[PDB]
Point group: D3
Chain length 232, copies 6
């Protein structure tokens, strides 16, 4: 399947490295989302309910904070796991790298499947708010599958793990948990998040073929090497 | 968690690029497998039954053939998706690359979780054979979660997609289907395969930090560029 | 959808009143059967298990006897419910009527859906025998949905109820139970039987438009009126 | 079981052909409705949820319109499927026929089971409105099983199919979909609708034994034959 | 496990016979409550829904009345089952006996498990009221497992059955139904009530070892013997 | 309901303290067992499968050993939990006490419900052996609900806890686990065991009203007091 019309490197070069033609064929790659009446969807509902009961815990507080993140806030959200600030102030080359792949992982890697299924999101299915909003706030009710935010989270984790392998496990756990936070908060079904990690991993392979990404990745690594020297 | 004792680059340099210390912490990263009595496991059983009914179709024939693959046969199993033979004969540098990461993706990336849960495999749970064996053949009954073979399949797909981005979607679909073949054949539960793609993607990030992998990857790309020239 | 190729009144005028062109479009009318992984199929399995536990009861004995019936034996199987023998000996016009619609209800009304889904039957799904057979006996393993026998049973009940309205409820219960006997015995899933009653009822409407059926139905009614006179 | 007290041909000869004594014994014929805690009811809930998500589609719009139909509006609701207007204006004999069996199919054929189980309807179970009402509108909350409207729909379809066999499949599909519209809108559980088609088919057999129905049916057929001549 | 801090005979000698050290180790004895995503919890939800539909029946009226009972009202709630008034007026020794074990059965026997799991109660899980309250009334939302009230109910039943064995079955049924009333009203999950009867039975064994309980029990029996003489 | 015909103190005074008239009305007290198609039974099956996977663990070994116990072996099976040998050699009065209530707890307390439902046992439902038998050994296939052995186990635990309150929690855990061993081994469904603890607790109340039991219980306590003196 061809990717549906949309933005890419030719329209937003600061948010995408890749063209529409280079997008992961998410529609062809991913299975369909669980249908109502499937055991798989019943499990999605179980994870929704589990998540809902976690909202009033420390993990729930983290989930609400994670759910407040825009696509652009994902990079900085890895700071503690990464071991140093991922900010425009402290790590401009790294922050530029991660910001510039937001569109590739969040949009291009998800668009085909997103637009085909236009899956209803949990909060909308139940007719309630999410963990970090009331009904005075407005969120898109559909396009749940796969999760763009989660795809960005996982893709970002994989790139960050390559830059700082000494904390790869902390980084990967953090990337994983960004996805789970969206399940806890009612933004996405578990299956949206599961599917997102597939396409999120796929787009990172594509990005490794892209000269601009390769260059910027090296700059981020060079920058990190200096950050390490000054810390030690 | 520390990776359990086992082989790595120091014992089998032809099958691993990475050391035990560089292994993905699969125990910490992955959730536990579905427990008996969970909706998640009921879905695993649904996928097992679905798979079982697919055994007598063309897709089932492919599943049985895929299930015959050893870890070393995975590389060549991508040939049609890749668009050219992945063999020692035709693409020695590529075949060497993919073979040398078998241990990293199949063993190191799965070992912690595998040994902790020692999960019973579907055929053993049901007391039956798999789609490609009778009970005269003997298979390990446990260590199901996550699937080592599937981790190799997905990691290999991600690397191959980077080498030949023009067929990234065919490659990724093939890598995905190697996992699903194991579900169809009764070797693994769906959740084993899902979990395997997480760690399979994670190890590819680690591999990108490894000088030997980086060098061999470039050799594979150089080789592929020549393969393209001679085909065109 | 057009009915698949097969027999009709032009090839077997003793077993069908209707032509292929007059067949109920079972493929278009019926929903698909429950898929593995659906709650609907889980219920089919519940009814299978319920049925299995009923096999060693009086109702189970009746189910095994009902399961021994060929399409041609259905007419006579209504005798007790009807209140008098439905035999070639005692009620030739009635027996002729009911026999001559076997193909219409059993084949024409089911063929499209049967051949499209080729659904696996319960005993085959579980790899076991039915309640009235061992594995030395051989039955078709597929084409479960909808049940031809059940369609004949229900269509026959509706026709019989019209002929003897004084025992319509006994007749209808009997027709219903012929379907349930097949669920108890493992020949069909509950949903096969449910679907069969839809098309079974539909074909009876078609039959009422057919001159030969209309004539033979009247002969059966005339015959029954005489049977009543001689009994009273 | 005897039919509970109520109207019949002796009290409302314009809405029933049949007497209370001629009613289908719905209590004896039908199984009980799914109990809370059964897999069958879990499936009813799945179909309710599926239906709910369909409310904002073209099929949902049709469902809301179908749900607006009173028993008397069912006849006309078949017009497009039938191929010509089923109205008092254009087809008075046909409209009279179908109107006069409303009580037989909607009431007599359902009353025993309806009054025994007094089953709670979906919207009432969930404490919400239906797809075509707000809570300012008031509907009966119980007597869900079986669906009277659906029984009328299916009985009407079977009669209409006999009158116009050339469009029997369109007619039958329409009759089927009237039932499904009630599931989509939250008026009835799937099982209410399934059960309704059983008794709906049963009552049509009884109606064929009734002189007044037979006469009026012939008038409807004669009328239709003239309608065909003037169209062609 | 040690019982968590709290009241016992040393602080409230009118409500407990036993010390903290004599408490049933409810945490060690009971399994954990069903987790969200378990079949066991799905059944708890089924019983909740079943209960909810029973609220508008005679049994529901009894459930609401039972749900109004405080721990101190349990004794008197057995009067009809016991065959004579269990009141301070009519049976002071009996009423004293049963009141004085409220803490032992309601608190000591449940505290360890209660405080460990702090399980959310049904009404709180669903965000609704119970059968006998509106949201203007306030109830604790957690500590559901096991049910203290049910433990008191069952322990009280076992003691009462010993005092009046001629009505042991009526008494035991009543004690059982006090638990079920809490399920019907939405105060507790079925599993809370099931677990409560385990610890409720356990504490009665402990109470039989306690001199003060033994003495008061004998006084209650002596009193009952006089009650029987005056009735006869 | 009256207890069905059978043995009691008048026929087997060494195995029962109580008469048929003193039996717990198990049919009236207990709910019916889960029906096939209920969520409750699906959970029973989950516990069966969970149990089956535990058979090859240390807990499974204990389960098989527990499953080897006859009713008469239950008393001695508490020895480790009790803290001293419960044998005819070492504690004749105690062993006599516990043996003499086998019929009361195992038979009288279960008979009504057992004979009414004649519930099929797990191993028979699945057509397999239990954890401690092959098919050369023969076990009763029905009468599963409630578990007589489990009722004896729990009743015995409650009596033992009264005799040695210092180890009440170890004793109660042991009694509980005797029930769970039967679930693990495939002798009983979880619900059989749950129900057994209800009637097991009930019969202990009745036993406390019986002079012979009271006397023998005191002898067991006197004996235990001497056992304690000689140990210390």
């Amino acid at each position: 399947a061809l990717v549906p019309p949309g933005n890419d490197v030719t329209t937003k070069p600061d948010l995408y490295y890749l063209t529409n033609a280079q997008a992961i064929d998410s529609l062809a790659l991913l299975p369909p989302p669980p249908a109502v009446g499937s055991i798989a969807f019943l499990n999605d509902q179980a994870m929704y309910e589990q998540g809902r009961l976690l909202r009033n815990t420390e993990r729930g507080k983290l989930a609400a904070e994670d759910a407040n993140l825009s696509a652009g806030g994902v990079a900085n959200a890895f700071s503690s796991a990464f071991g140093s600030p991922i900010t425009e102030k402290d790590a401009p080359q790294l922050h530029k790298l991660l910001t510039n792949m937001i569109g590739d992982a969040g949009d291009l890697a998800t668009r085909g499947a997103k637009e085909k299924y236009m899956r209803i999101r949990p909060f909308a299915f139940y007719g309630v708010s999410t963990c970090n909003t009331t009904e005075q706030d407005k969120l898109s009710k559909n396009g749940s599958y796969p999760s763009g935010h989660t795809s960005i989270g996982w893709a970002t984790a994989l790139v960050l793990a390559e830059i700082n392998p000494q904390r790869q496990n902390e980084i990967l756990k953090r990337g994983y948990e960004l996805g789970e936070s969206r399940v806890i908060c009612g933004y996405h079904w578990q299956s949206d998040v599961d599917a997102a990690r597939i396409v999120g991993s796929a787009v990172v392979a594509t990005l490794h073929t892209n000269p601009a990404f390769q260059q910027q990745l090296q700059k981020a690594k060079d920058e990190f090497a200096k950050t390490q020297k000054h810390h030690h």
